[PDB]
């Protein structure tokens, strides 16, 4: 598409500038163009791709939640009829959000995942696939909702299986994957006990492995462990 004429390295450079300028839509478009060059992504490049799209969808999701809450209030007893506008605008934001999720899932399917052989890349991309199906599940209300949820589950489960075999329990990708799969269990799959068990086991196994780490790696791992602890404190 529109990035086809720009050099891969220039797209990467501009994605980093867009990040500094908090221009996340631009950042995502540059990283999509970089992926579409067809070469595998380095660790830093995968992080740029993820940061860009997580910020774009994160803004859409927050807006969707505001509009969904207004719509839900509109449907309570005693609420004045205000016409179709709230539903229409929530649907507009929802459709945009679904489009971005479909875009990310398309990049993962064509062809990031199939070319990713190292644990660090494959787990990262499968986690991303689980996340974007999870974001689709947050807004799903129809006949494919069960299949969207199962798609998120299946991607997370494959990422978990690889991460347990191939990564240490303190690895930041393994930890962030477990954090997100635990959130999936809690608020998507109606499985709070599974969410709590996963967060606790992940935390405890990471704790036991901290002694192996340098100071910098210790800081990286404990930062994510604290997010697991935050959720356990909220949920128990």
């Amino acid at each position: 598409g529109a990035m086809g004429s720009m050099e891969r390295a220039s797209l990467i450079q501009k994605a980093k500038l867009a990040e500094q300028a908090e221009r996340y839509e631009d950042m995502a478009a540059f990283m999509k163009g970089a992926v579409e060059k067809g070469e595998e992504l380095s660790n830093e490049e995968r992080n740029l791709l993820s940061v860009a799209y997580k910020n774009v969808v994160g803004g859409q999701r927050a807006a969707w939640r505001v509009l969904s809450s207004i719509e839900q209030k509109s449907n309570e007893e005693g609420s004045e009829e205000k016409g179709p506008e709230v539903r229409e605008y929530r649907e507009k934001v929802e459709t945009e959000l679904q489009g971005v999720c479909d875009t990310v899932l398309g990049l993962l399917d064509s062809h990031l995942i199939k070319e990713a052989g190292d644990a660090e890349s494959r787990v990262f991309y499968l986690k991303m696939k689980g996340d974007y199906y999870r974001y689709l599940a947050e807004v799903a209300t129809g006949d494919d909702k069960k299949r969207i949820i199962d798609s998120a589950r299946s991607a997370y489960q494959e990422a978990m299986d690889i991460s347990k075999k191939e990564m240490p329990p303190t690895n930041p990708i393994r930890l962030g994957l477990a954090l997100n799969f635990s959130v999936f269990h809690y608020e998507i799959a109606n499985s709070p006990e599974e969410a709590i068990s996963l967060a606790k086991t992940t935390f405890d196994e990471a704790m036991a492995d901290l002694h192996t780490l340098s100071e910098d790696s210790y800081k990286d791992s404990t930062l994510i462990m604290q997010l697991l602890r935050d959720n356990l404190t909220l949920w128990t």
């Binding site: 954090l179 959130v183 809690y186 994510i224 997010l227 959720n231």
Partner: peptide, 8 residues
């Protein structure tokens, strides 16, 4: 307090 997912 909203639950944490993997974010900066």
């Amino acid at each position: 307090r909203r639950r944490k997912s993997c974010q900066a």
